[PDB]
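Anyone? Bumping this.
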Amino acid sequence: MKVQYSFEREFEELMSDLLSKYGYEMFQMDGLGDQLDVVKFTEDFVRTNISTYFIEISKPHTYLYSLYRIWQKMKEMFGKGVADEFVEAQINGAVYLHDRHHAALMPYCFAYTLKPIVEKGLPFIKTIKSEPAKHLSTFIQHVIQFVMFASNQSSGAVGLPDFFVWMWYFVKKDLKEGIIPRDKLDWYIEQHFQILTYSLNQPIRTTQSPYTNFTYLDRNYIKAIFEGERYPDGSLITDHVEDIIALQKHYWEWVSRERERQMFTFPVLTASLLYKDGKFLDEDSARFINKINMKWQDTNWYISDSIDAVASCCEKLKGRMNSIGGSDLNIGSFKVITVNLPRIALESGGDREKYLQILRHRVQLIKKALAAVREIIKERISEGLLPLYENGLMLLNRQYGTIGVTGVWESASIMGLTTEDIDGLKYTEEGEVFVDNVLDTIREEAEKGYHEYGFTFNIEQVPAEKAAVTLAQKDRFLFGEKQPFEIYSNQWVPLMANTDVLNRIRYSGKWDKKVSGGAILHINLKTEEESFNMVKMIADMGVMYFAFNTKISVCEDGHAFYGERCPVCGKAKVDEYMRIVGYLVPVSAFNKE
Amino acid sequence: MKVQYSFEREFEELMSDLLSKYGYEMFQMDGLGDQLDVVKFTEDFVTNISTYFIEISKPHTYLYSLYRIWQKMKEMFGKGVADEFVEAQINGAVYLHDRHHAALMPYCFAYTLKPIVEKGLPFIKTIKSEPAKHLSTFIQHVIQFVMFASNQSSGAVGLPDFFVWMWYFVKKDLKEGIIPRDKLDWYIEQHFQILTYSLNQPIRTTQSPYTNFTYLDRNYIKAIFEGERYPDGSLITDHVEDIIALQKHYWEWVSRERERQMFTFPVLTASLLYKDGKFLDEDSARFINKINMKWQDTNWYISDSIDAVASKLKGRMNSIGGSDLNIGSFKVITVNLPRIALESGGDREKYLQILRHRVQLIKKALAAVREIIKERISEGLLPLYENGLMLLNRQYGTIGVTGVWESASIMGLTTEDIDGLKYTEEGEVFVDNVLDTIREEAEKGYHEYGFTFNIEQVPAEKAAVTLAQKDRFLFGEKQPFEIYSNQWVPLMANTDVLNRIRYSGKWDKKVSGGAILHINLTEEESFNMVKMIADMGVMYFAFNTKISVCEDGHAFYGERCPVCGKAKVDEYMRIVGYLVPVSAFN
Ligand SMILES: Nc1ncnc2c1ncn2[C@H]1C[C@H](O)[C@@H](COP(=O)(O)OP(=O)(O)OP(=O)(O)O)O1
Ligand SMILES: Nc1ncnc2c1ncn2[C@H]1C[C@H](O)[C@@H](COP(=O)(O)OP(=O)(O)OP(=O)(O)O)O1
Ligand SMILES: [Mg+2]
Ligand SMILES: [Mg+2]
Ligand SMILES: [Zn+2]
Ligand SMILES: [Zn+2]
C-alpha cells in the first residue's frame, strides 16, 4: 500500500532532489527510510513491553512532519534557499536537530520553581482540579503529578532546584498540627523522600522514567534566590535557611543509604556552590557534599563565582543552562540544534580560515532554524496545546535557543591539530588556539543573535547520546576513510583517552566559561581532605560543572554495592551503574541503546 | 509523497477490491482515509500536545492490526474467511473494538490485589518495589499498578477487592503508631483522597484510566475469601465487618467529596446477593440505597448466587462495571444487528441465518486475536500475564451486540401504544431468538476453540454512531436512525419504565448480566423501587441525575453553584453506564 503525505510540491521536489543527491542510505541513516514503513517497523519491533511500541511507531512520522513544518516556517521567514539548506543540512548531518520527532510540537526543557504549585495547586490538569496542598503527603503528590504532566509536555529535563525549600514548609506545617507524630518525624520525612524518588523512577514517559534534577542549593543561593519571598504562612523563606539546608542534607544522606536497598538514576543530583578567590562561601555545605559523595560519588559539583544571575530570581538571559543538571531556577532551553564540527573539519581540508567561515555560516543557519522552531512553539502555545506556558510554569522568555556542539576533539584531530606527549593525548598549541577560535566565533554569533532575533542563544557541549553516533556514521558515509572515528566526543578530551587529568581540568578551565557552564567534566576514579583539596583545585582552575565516577555494582534485585557479591542478598553482580554522559545509568542499557 | 506499507499482495489486492466496491468514503468512515495522512491529520488536530502523540498513530496501528488479524485468520481458517472478516470490519457488518490495539494488547481485567500486596511491583523494571509495609505505600503501589495496567490494556482496570486489602494496612499502620490517634478518619480519608485524585489524572494522557471499585456485600466477601489469609496470618473472613465499615467509609466520603470536586473514577458498583424477594445482606443494600440518594453515583449489581465467585468460565463480565474478581475479556467484537435487519428485508429466517453465520465469523476473528495475544505474551511484550495479574484463561472472547431496538424496528417488530414505544409480541420473540442464537454459538465456541465466549450489549460509545453512519451510507433512507442503542429500549424513548424493567428482566439473563439498565429521574420509595427492579430479574442497573458543575468543578444541582456562585458550565450524566461530562461526550 501507498499512503499519501500531503506536502507542498516544493518540499516534495526538495525531498526527491535530496534522495537523488544522497541516496536511500542517507535517509535510512536519518531515520526517514524503512522506519516509515509501519508494517516493517512493527514486525521488526515484535522480534521492554508493548507500551513502548505505541511510543516508537510514530517518531519517524512526527519527525517527518516536524522537518516539513520547520521547512515551511523557515521558507516563510528566510526564503526557500535557507529552508532548503537547513533541510539538506539536517538530513545529511551538517547539523543535528534534537528531539526531532518533537521539534515542531513541543519544547525541550525547564528548571522550574514549585512556587506556583504550592500557591495555586493543579488547575492546569483539567480532568480534575486540585486546591493548593495543605499537607506533606499532598505536596509530594502534587510534585509527582506536576512532573508526570511536564514530562509529557516537553522532551528534556524537568528541573526541580527549589524542591526542599518548599518541602520544608509542609514538613513543619504537618509537624506543628500533629499530622506528623513527633516520634515518627524522621520516618515520615524519609518515607516521603522514598515515595517521591520511587515515583520519579517509574516509567511515566512509558519507554523510560522522566528526566528530573534536584539541586542542593547552598546558603548563598537560597538567600539570593529567595530574598524577600514568603511562604503561605506569611513568613520569610530566608528566615528558614538552616532548616532548608538541614532537610537537603537529610535527603542526600537518605539517598546514600537508600541506594543499598535499591539503585536509581533519578533525580540527578547537583550541588550548587558559590566559590571565589580560592574558597567556598558556604564551606559547611561544600564539606558536607564532599563527605557524602565519598560513598557513591552520585552528586555533580556546580561551581559559580557569582550569584548575580540568580539574584532575587523568584530581556537578555544570563542564568546557567545545562542539559545534564545544574540549570539555574527558571532557566531552560526550548530547543537544541547541534553543529557537526567534524563535518566542518572534513569540508575545510585543514584550512582554519575556511573552517571558521563555514562554521560562522552554519551557526547563522542554525540560529534561523531556532528562530523558526520558536515561532512554531509560539503557534502551539496559541493553539492551547502547551498549558505549562499559559499557567506560568514554563517561561518562554526564560528559555534559550541552544547552539549545540559535539566532536570538538575529533574536529581538531581531522584538522591535524592534536597530538600526544608524556602527559597523554592533547591539543597542539595551535589546536588550543583553534578551539578558542571556534568557541569564540560561536559566542559572537550567539551574541549577535539576541539583537537579530529578540531572544537569547546559548552554547552547550551536549551529551549527544545518539548524535555522537549518528553524525559520525553520516560523516563516515560521506567521507569514508577520512572520518576514522566511530563516535564523536561530548567532553573537551575524549572520556576514553588516557591523558593527564590535569590537562582535562586545564581544558575545562579554559573552555567551560566560553560555553557559560554548558559542559561537564567527569573523572573516573584517599582521605576526605584529599578529596576536598582536589575539589578546590578543580574549582580554582575555572571548571564549572564536574563529577568523579565510581563503578557501582548491582545484583538482579537492584541492590547497589561495590564488588562482585551483594551484601544484602548475597547474589552476584549482574550489571554496573556508571556516569557515562553525566548521570548514573545501567551500562547494559546504554550499550543496548 | 508516497510511503510504502509492505503487505502481502493478497491483502493489498483485498484492500484494492474493497476500495473499488465501497468507495473512499467508507474507508474514511472506518478511519482508513485522510487519517493515515500524517500532515492532514496533524494540521487538522492543531486537550493538549500529549494527546497528539497518542492519536496520531491510531489509524496506522489499526491498519497493522487489521492486517495481522487477516494474516492469522488466513493461517487458521483460510483466505476466504479472513477476507470476509476484513470486508465485514471495513463495511461495518461487525465492529472490532479498540481496533488500534487489537493485534497488540488485550482489553480488560478485574484484578485481585493479592499479588501486589504479596510481591509488590516486580513487573516494573526501572526500579524494584518490595511488598508494601504501610498504607501510604499500599496506596502508591495501587496507583503505580493501575498506571502500568492501563497502558498494557485497552479497557477497564477493575479493583473489586481494593478495600479487603486496604483495611489490613489501615490496621497495620494503626498498630505501629504511624497514625495520629485523634485523626484516624482524616487519615483514612486522606488516603481515599490521594488514591481517588490520582485515578482521575491524565495518565492514559488524553483521559484518565478507566477503573472500577466494587462494594462487596458480606456474602461476596465470605464466598470469595473463604480460607484466604492476610500477610499477618489472620483469616480474611474474620474481618468482614471491618472490611464493610471501610467500604461504607469510602462510599460516604466520595459522596461528600463530590461537592468539593466532581470526578468520574473509580466507577462505583455495589454487588449484592438477592434471592427469593430479599437481599441476603440487607444492611449493605439499605446503606447503598441511602448513600445513592444524593448523586446516584453507584450502579447496582444483583446476583441470585455466589457459586461463580466461590473460593469453562462462569463469572460476570461487564464493560461498565461489576465484573467479578479475576474475570475479564481479551477482546470484544460486536455484531451490527441493524445491518442484518437491512440485509434480511424483513425475512426473519434469513435474518437468523445471516446472524448465525456472522457470529461464527466473529468467533473465528476472536480466536485469531487470542492466538496473537499469545504470541505477544511469548515475545515478552505483555508482562501483566507473565506476573499472574492478568490471567488469559480467565478472559472471555466477547461477542458484542448493539442496535437491538433499531434492528427490531427495521424488521417492523416495534410499536407504540399509550404506554409508549415497545416491542410487539412477535418482536419479543424475535429478540428471544436472536439472543438464543448468539448464546448457542457462544456455548459451541468453548468446544470449538478451547476458550469461553460471553455476550455483551456493549456501551458502543463510538460504534453506535459509526455503524449507523456506515449503514446510512450503504442503505440510505432504509436506515432512519442517527445512532444505535445500547440498552434493550433506547434511553430517550417514550417508554413506560415497567416495560424497560420487564425487557431487562427477560434478556439480562440471556447475556449473563452483560448489559445495563439506567433510568433518568424519599428513601423508602427508592428502596422499594430497587427491590421491585431486582425482583424482575434485572442484573445491573442505575438511576440518573443531572449533575451540574461550575468552572471550578464543584458538583451541585441547579443553574448556579451553591459553593462559589458561578454559573453552571457543564453536566455530569450517566450516558453509557458511568458518570461523564456531557460536553466532552459531544
Ligand atoms: N511511589 C512509589 N512507587 C513505587 N514503589 C514505592 C514508592 N514508594 C516506595 N516504594 C517502594 C519502596 C519499597 O521497596 C516498597 C515498600 O515501601 P515501604 O512500605 O515504605 O517499606 P520500607 O521497606 O520503606 O520500610 P519503611 O518504610 O518502614 O522504612 O515500596
Ligand atoms: N494524588 C493527588 N493528585 C492530585 N491532587 C490531589 C491528590 N490527592 C489529593 N489531591 C488534591 C485534593 C485537594 O484539592 C488538594 C489538597 O489536598 P489536601 O492537601 O489533602 O487538602 P484538603 O483540602 O484535603 O484538606 P484536608 O486534607 O486537611 O481535609 O490536593
Ligand atoms: Mg518506606
Ligand atoms: Mg486531604
Ligand atoms: Zn542483592
Ligand atoms: Zn462552584
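Late reply, but here is one note on the structure posted above: Residues 47-586 of chain B form one domain.
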